[PDB]
Write a protein that binds this ligand. Structure first.
Ligand SMILES: [Zn+2]
Ligand SMILES: [Zn+2]
Lengths: 120, 119
DNA sequence: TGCAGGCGCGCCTGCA
DNA sequence: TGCAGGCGCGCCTGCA
DNA sequence: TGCAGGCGCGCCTGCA
DNA sequence: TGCAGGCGCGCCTGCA
């Protein structure tokens, strides 16, 4: 009771506010392209055989979320799988991943379960 | 909105939100024992600077440990309820009204966030 | 309900 | 020297 | 010198 | 509907 009341008054940190901004950014795109269910299926079931969850690729490959840039597959693999993920060099797509980042296609797959972490 | 909160619950960087709950649980347990919990809720919800000092015992080095993390008690609770980007105790100055301020080295340390001003 | 295991303050080490 | 961080004994908690 | 980060126009939201 | 304001991708800049 008092603990949960006092916790509600907590000033929110920028990292949690940014994570929410990162998830809202992806959800808005997936909703528009009919891919939101697949993201929830991939995240909650950890199923590697899920479809590619794609977003359009930018000219430099970077994605901006609340004044912060990063590679989109790296942003969402750090979010749902490896918080200590340093760079794209630590990621390796599976053969089944049609839209892997490394392939530089029109769309980029951000399904965290289509990438394997390597120790570079 | 429902999908965003659902998907957010699945994130991996949850090390900091479980800690804030442990930090609040730690303070509440001490304030209930000493009859000061209502004053904390009055200070937090009303932002009233003229609230009474909300004290906890002071340790030998002045640091407080919450779930394997150490910090100065007034800094911990000012960052929690007022300034998340609060860097160190050097950015805090107690109001003159505050009898149990951190810098006073007394037996009890006041952790009412509304008895400190940011500099 | 006895008791294994969690965790904090005090003690100590180790840099800048 | 201000500060960070590791870890044990004493205190406290939650099960079979 | 590669590349992180600043910032504007275009896009979009939201009031009157 | 005239207008304000938030923010990203594309463009551009400044360091270690
Ligand atoms: Zn894929
Ligand atoms: Zn005070």
């Amino acid at each position: 009771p008092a603990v949960k009341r006092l916790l509600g008054w907590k000033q929110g940190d920028e990292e949690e506010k940014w994570c929410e901004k990162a998830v809202k950014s992806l959800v808005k795109k997936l909703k528009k392209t009919g891919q939101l269910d697949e993201l929830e299926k991939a995240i909650t079931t950890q199923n590697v055989n899920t479809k590619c969850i794609t977003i359009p690729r930018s000219l430099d490959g970077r994605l901006q979320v609340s004044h912060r840039k990063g590679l989109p597959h790296v942003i969402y693999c750090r979010l749902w799988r490896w918080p200590d993920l340093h760079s794209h060099h630590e990621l390796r797509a599976m053969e089944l991943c049609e839209f892997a980042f490394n392939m530089k296609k029109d769309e980029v797959c951000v399904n965290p379960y289509h990438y394997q972490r390597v120790e570079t």
